[PDB]
Amino acid sequence: GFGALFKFLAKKVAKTVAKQAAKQGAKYVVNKQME
Numbered sequence: 001g002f003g004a005l006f007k008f009l010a011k012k013v014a015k016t017v018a019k020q021a022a023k024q025g026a027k028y029v030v031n032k033q034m035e
Contacts, residue, residue, distance in 0.1 A: 017023075
């Protein structure tokens, strides 16, 4: 019913992630290097 979020979330969901492109770039190696 609410098909307006497919054009409204593109301004939100695709706004914070653009800056956090490294939030998951190093997670399985950051803790592995410590070991």
